[PDB]
RNA sequence: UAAUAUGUCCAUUGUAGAUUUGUGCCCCACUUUGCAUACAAUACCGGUAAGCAAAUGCUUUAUUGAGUACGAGCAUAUUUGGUAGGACCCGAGAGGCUUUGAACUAAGCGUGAUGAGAUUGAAGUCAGACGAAAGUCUGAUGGAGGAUCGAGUUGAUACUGACGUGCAAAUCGUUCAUUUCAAUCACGUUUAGGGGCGAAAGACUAAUCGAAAAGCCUAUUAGCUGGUUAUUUUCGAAAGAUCUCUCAGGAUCGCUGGAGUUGAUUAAUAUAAUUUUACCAGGUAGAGAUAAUGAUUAGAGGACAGGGCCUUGACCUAUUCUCAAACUCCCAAUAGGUAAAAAGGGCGAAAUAACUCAAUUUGUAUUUCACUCAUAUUAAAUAAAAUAACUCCAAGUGGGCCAUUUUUGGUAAGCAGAACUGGCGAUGAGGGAUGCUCCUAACGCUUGGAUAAGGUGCCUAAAUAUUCGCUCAUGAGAUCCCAUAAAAGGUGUUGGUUCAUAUGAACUAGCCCUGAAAAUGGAUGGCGCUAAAGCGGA
RNA sequence: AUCCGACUGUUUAAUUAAAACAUAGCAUUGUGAAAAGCCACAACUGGUAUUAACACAAUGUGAUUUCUGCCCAGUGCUUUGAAUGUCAACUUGAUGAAAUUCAAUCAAGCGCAGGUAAACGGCGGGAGUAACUAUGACUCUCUUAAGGUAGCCAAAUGCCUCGUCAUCUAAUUAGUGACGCGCAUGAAUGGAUUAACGAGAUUCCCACUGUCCCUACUUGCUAUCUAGCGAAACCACAGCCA
RNA sequence: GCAGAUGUCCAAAGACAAGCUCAAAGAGAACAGAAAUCUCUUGUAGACUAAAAGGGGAAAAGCUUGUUUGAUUUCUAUUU
RNA sequence: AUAUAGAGGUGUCUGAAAAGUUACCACAGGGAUAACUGGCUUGUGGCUGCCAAGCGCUCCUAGCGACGUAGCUUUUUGAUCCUUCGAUGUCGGCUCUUCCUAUCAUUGGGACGCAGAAGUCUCAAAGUGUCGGAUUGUUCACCCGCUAAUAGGGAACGUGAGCUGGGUUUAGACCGUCGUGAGACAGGUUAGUUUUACCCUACUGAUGAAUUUUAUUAUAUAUAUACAUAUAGUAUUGUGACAGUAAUCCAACUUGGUACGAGAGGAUUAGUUGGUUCAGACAAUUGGUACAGCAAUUGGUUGACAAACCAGUGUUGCGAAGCUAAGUCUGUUGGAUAAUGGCUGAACGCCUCUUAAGCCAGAAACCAUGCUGAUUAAACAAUACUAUCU
RNA sequence: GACUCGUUCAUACUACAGUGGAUACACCAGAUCCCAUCAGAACUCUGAAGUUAAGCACUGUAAGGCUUGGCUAGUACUGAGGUGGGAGACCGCUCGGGAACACCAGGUGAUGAGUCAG
């Protein structure tokens, strides 16, 4: 069925992805990535919490999926299903391989860096503690060393809260869905 | 067929080059000569092209030869090497050739012998009994049988008994199978080695058998194993590579020694695992995905298909999340190449040519003259740079392994496979308790000194030094490789950070505790150590 | 009671005594003779053979009982040959100045056409289908030289497997009797069955016992000590551990 | 180790020249439809180039046409 | 025939013209290379965590624990090929000892989805124990039964100069499949030599010298003295450092049909009597044993009777004594603790088992007591006499 | 002012606009001949009636692109050293070297030879 997961912890082997030279690779267990009110505006949620791994590791896709599930369920238990936005900001492309000689492809892995974020929760400023808790719970399921990190950003958008507010006040920013575009003074009239 | 070719006894032309000759006794800066040799260039000889072609073959053109251009060889002594031989020594299994054996054993034959004693009781025979008939029974006798049991004999079933440096290179004990027949034994005799003999086990053929023994061919051959003999000194490797019926070998390169030569000895030019100043060449690390390929998660904003103006879609547009060893707009570090001037370069003349051009001189290249280029700081440093080149002759080696870093396969491996460098191997010494590779440092023999790595409680030479913290452990901790520990905890203590109203939080990181279980007894190396002799410093 | 061999016999001298070999019986094949068969020998000659088809030689199977199915495409063996493809020397002819080069020819052998399995051997797969379901007499289909027949079986033949049901036991991966789409049974590779026999292989029952519970005592001979005599293998040096 | 490929194919798919521009998309035109042909617009190649894959290639190295055999003989310097 | 240039081909592609088998094998070698241990690794197996979606009537966590994740172990099988091919005897059983703990039972505890009983989870605990059988060569497995329980392991997958040799893995042979065949089988079946201790060490016992750079826990008449005592030889009695250790579990009944429970059921703890296993003895008694000894008797032999003898101890019967089990007897309790429960009591004005300082009760565990040795201490003391002693 | 041959080969491109045509370019007019096709569309030839409408030149766009520079950022990465840390994964320090995307701002050409018109 599966291996102890400690076999595919460290980033040994160069990134081996799904392409013309892999072919027979099973589907990743994680498919949703982002859930809980995914169609919300940028102005809807202000509190953004990240799950930053301080480990150069691989992270099974299945593990990631499990973590996501944990995050979701906890959120549901806590507040409304439409009061948060869960984003998995790491995708598994590096397909592992097993030998039963060159091994045959078996499952994918979501290899990470020392600085990059795993899970990101965009919620209202009221439910930040809950979000943090959820993140922590999720972490219990990843390998290595992770850390819950509340951001000064507005939510997924690369602007500080105050800055965002300022922008809104002078109308230099247009909100689409989750992501927002900043008017740069560049295009034609 | 056979080496300028009779203009001249002269001895082809260069560029560096020893020695000379002079000028101002080694360097200098010129002249002067130009050994050896290197590097070319020409001639010419043989062949072969090509062009011509009836000659003694001719040619302004090619190529090729182990050629030639004023000979160097021959002989011999020693040497190493390579080859043949017994071939450094010792070692096979075998192959053949000619003999010797059947006293053992195998079978056949000839002549002889040998099998205590019992048991069963076949035919035939005799007597008796019954039946309308056919016929059928009963008691003897008889002594048949590859019948039965069984001493001996011949064997060898079991104890897998004893013995197993025995009594014995197959024995002993008990048990067992065999005993009138395919029996057993003796003597004689026949059959002999790729042969015999075989109720067949490749059995046996003189303790020898899936091809005897003896001698010879033979000192057969072995890329394989073991061995391979005085001392000191000097130099000193490789375990790459290409080919190999090759992967335990060999051949040739590499690396090494010796021999020699040309040089250098003019703190120079040559040159250098080095750097600079120039100039390049890259596409790895990184970075990118709203740059292309391939992926890839979302919604937002928009204008073809389906259902009853709305919904589901796809499609654009602007975005967004994450990516690539076999993606790239870009692109390091490191590594690499050329450059940095006298056998040369400048600007010029005149030459020469069958080349080139439109230009007998348009240029090219060559040659001879000119003028003139830093130089003792030596055309940027620095250089125990000539200990250099080069040539020869050979040896060993061609199983490698380890460490940091980069790295591929592999769950991983003291695993397999690679890259750069260093080691070990070939290497001791001081340290790491102990150790082929870790650190220090490579080694003549001595004295004194001062260190390196590491240490300084004792073992153990050197501090129970000083100085500021941190740790208490009812399985502490103790220094690269290294001899393991983790996720997760901890109202243990010690600092912090962020917050709130001297408390309440949340975190955070040090030490410490839990998590933490394997087999002989037990290992920071031991003893021990807690105001450390622990951990982190100074 | 089961398995194997029928039996008496023989065998690997010194690890295998048997289920191996032999055996009678059965079956096959060749050969009518010194020009035959099978074999030996360098040769000439010889053996069988002082033989003659109830013989000799060569095989296979292995008493009896009961049977030995199907298949000659494959490989063998074998039978007919101027219809016959090929197939050698010689021969013969053509060519040439000749060497040669070419053609042609009734050899066997093979090819062509048969015969042969007690010669070597081999001997199917899928579907569908019967008043509660199952199974499939029966049907279709691809294909083979023939598609394994009578039997027999988890047999010394069964991987799965310690196969399912019985039976033996308190309990049985054993034994026995069944079952059988049998990886991969099977008919002189003989199949199936067998009385008697076996230092054969296997299981159970009764008797019997120190095999064992659970050891004890005892006897000879050794060991032991002495007198006498007196080796060897082995041995780098040696000999405590964590 | 990984993803593959080769033992060939071609009088042209060779040679030279000329002309032309491809894939795709959109908007159009009887039959005509998701593919038939034609036209225009846009078209850095997203086509095609004998085949593996990687280069390279646009008044071409692709496609169309014309003319042809240099897929010729001999010999060097050489690179892998 | 050459010369030159192509072509006919070597795909093992720098280019032999080439099929098998050996379980009948031989030789040279190889740990450059397998099957065995160990070693490295731990994928696999086994064991332990962490998180908590649920399950568990209600309830995340009594017990569980998905999705995940972190380890450890080498009792699995691999991976590996470092060690050994001038041999480390290759499975299993029997036998025997020790070690481990990842404890099945027993002791003490804590938790429960603990009313009692029974049980489940868990902690200190390895002191003591963990069987008889049927089938299989088996390890493993599966039953049957007893049991307090029938826990898991290791020690060169402990243990072949200990054995056994059933299997695997020689030669014989049979069957099935495979191969044209010789033969092959990680298919089945049967028959198939298990050599040597007398060496060193280790262990078990058995003697036994020697021991002055060696000793001394005092001696001597309140004072002395290590600037000191000590001869030796026998012999008795002791000392006892140190080493070894031993006892173990159950049943029945009484407590009690009581506590508890709606009821059915139904105990802890003591106490008593027994037993099991083990150990140490011992033999009155029972049995066992016979080459003390009597008695009988068979065949033979001495002329007979008698007395005997011989038959590897002739064979019986009985058999003292001596050994011996299947027989009999005996097999302690303190100290200090672990788990745990507490106590006083801060940190932290309360609380707090101390997750401070101090205490307390507490286990089949530990150490004593007890028991065995004590040329394990080269030990020593005291007495008794003696050869000269001062 | 314009053209021809060019050089660098986007500051030169593209998209949408605007402005300009003395000479020039260009479009355009015609097909006998050389020629080329399905087609005088192209190509070729012969012209000069018109026109800047396009080509072309020039300019504009809080243009796309490209090109310089800052800024990312001394961040990422990295050469050498370390008995440095960290169980490890990896991460500091010492001597050095040093990116990229994005972002912001500037820029949108220059030029060699010749000829022609005034
Ligand atoms: Mg596992
Ligand atoms: Mg790898
Ligand atoms: Mg010799
Ligand atoms: Mg030969
Ligand atoms: Mg004889
Ligand atoms: Mg005889
Ligand atoms: Mg025998
Ligand atoms: Mg014996
Ligand atoms: Mg003996
Ligand atoms: Mg044989
Ligand atoms: Mg020899
Ligand atoms: Mg030297
Ligand atoms: Mg060797
Ligand atoms: Mg990268
Ligand atoms: Mg990235
Ligand atoms: Mg790349
Ligand atoms: Mg060596
Ligand atoms: Mg060294
Ligand atoms: Mg050490
Ligand atoms: Mg160093
Ligand atoms: Mg000194
Ligand atoms: Mg000093
Ligand atoms: Mg000292
Ligand atoms: Mg101590
Ligand atoms: Mg110390
Ligand atoms: Mg028989
Ligand atoms: Mg024998
Ligand atoms: Mg027979
Ligand atoms: Mg028969
Ligand atoms: Mg038949
Ligand atoms: Mg014929
Ligand atoms: Mg049948
Ligand atoms: Mg039985
Ligand atoms: Mg049966
Ligand atoms: Mg068959
Ligand atoms: Mg017999
Ligand atoms: Mg001797
Ligand atoms: Mg063209
Ligand atoms: Mg090895
Ligand atoms: Mg594991
Ligand atoms: Mg050895
Ligand atoms: Mg031995
Ligand atoms: Mg041994
Ligand atoms: Mg425990
Ligand atoms: Mg329990
Ligand atoms: Mg209870
Ligand atoms: Mg083991
Ligand atoms: Mg032994
Ligand atoms: Mg033995
Ligand atoms: Mg054994
Ligand atoms: Mg056996
Ligand atoms: Mg055998
Ligand atoms: Mg008695
Ligand atoms: Mg007598
Ligand atoms: Mg008696
Ligand atoms: Mg405290
Ligand atoms: Mg205009
Ligand atoms: Mg712009």
Residue A146 and residue A118 in contact, taking contact as beta carbons nearer than 8 Å: yes
Residue A156 and residue A87 in contact, taking contact as beta carbons nearer than 8 Å: yes
- Token pair 């809980």 is found at A36
CA proximity to A164, closest of A42, A37, A38 = A42
The answer to whether the annotation marks A78 as part of a ligand binding site is no
Can you state the angle between helices A128-139 and A61-78, rounded to 10 degrees? 150
Question: Resolution, rounded to a tenth of an Å?
Answer: 3.2
- Token pair 């791994």 is found at A53
Interatomic CA–C1' length for residue A137 and nucleotide B469, angstroms: 37
CA A166 vs. chain centroid, Å, equals 28
Q: Can you say whether the dihedral through the CA atoms of A114, A115, A118, A123 is positive or negative?
A: positive
Residue A65 is given by DSSP the state H
Instruction: Report the separation in Å between the CA atom of A188 and the middle of ligand 57, taken as the mean of its atom positions.
Output: 25
Residue A87 and residue A121 in contact, taking contact as beta carbons nearer than 8 Å: yes
Residues in chain A: 189
Distance CA(A67)–CA(A144), nearest Å, equals 14
Instruction: Report the separation in Å between the CA atom of A53 and the middle of ligand 31, taken as the mean of its atom positions.
Output: 95
Distance CA(A60)–CA(A9), nearest Å, equals 8
């Amino acid at each position: 069925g599966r291996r102890p997961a400690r076999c595919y912890r460290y980033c040994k082997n160069k990134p081996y992805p799904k392409s013309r030279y892999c072919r027979g690779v099973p589907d990743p267990k994680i498919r949703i990535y982002d859930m809980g009110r995914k169609k919300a505006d940028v102005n809807e949620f202000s509190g953004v919490v990240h799950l930053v791994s301080y480990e150069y590791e691989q992270i099974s896709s299945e593990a990631l999926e499990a973590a996501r599930i944990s995050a979701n369920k906890y959120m549901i238990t806590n507040c409304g299903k439409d009061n948060f936005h869960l984003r998995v900001r790491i995708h598994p492309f590096h397909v592992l391989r097993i030998n039963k000689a060159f091994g045959k492809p078996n499952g994918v892995v979501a290899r990470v860096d020392i600085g990059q974020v795993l899970l990101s929760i965009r919620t209202k400023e009221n439910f930040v503690s809950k979000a943090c808790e959820a993140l922590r719970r999720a972490k219990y399921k990843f390998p290595g060393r992770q850390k819950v990190f509340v951001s000064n950003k507005w939510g997924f958008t690369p602007f500080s809260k105050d800055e965002y507010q300022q922008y809104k006040k002078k109308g230099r920013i247009i909100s689409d869905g989750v992501s927002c575009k900043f008017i740069r003074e560049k295009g034609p009239l």
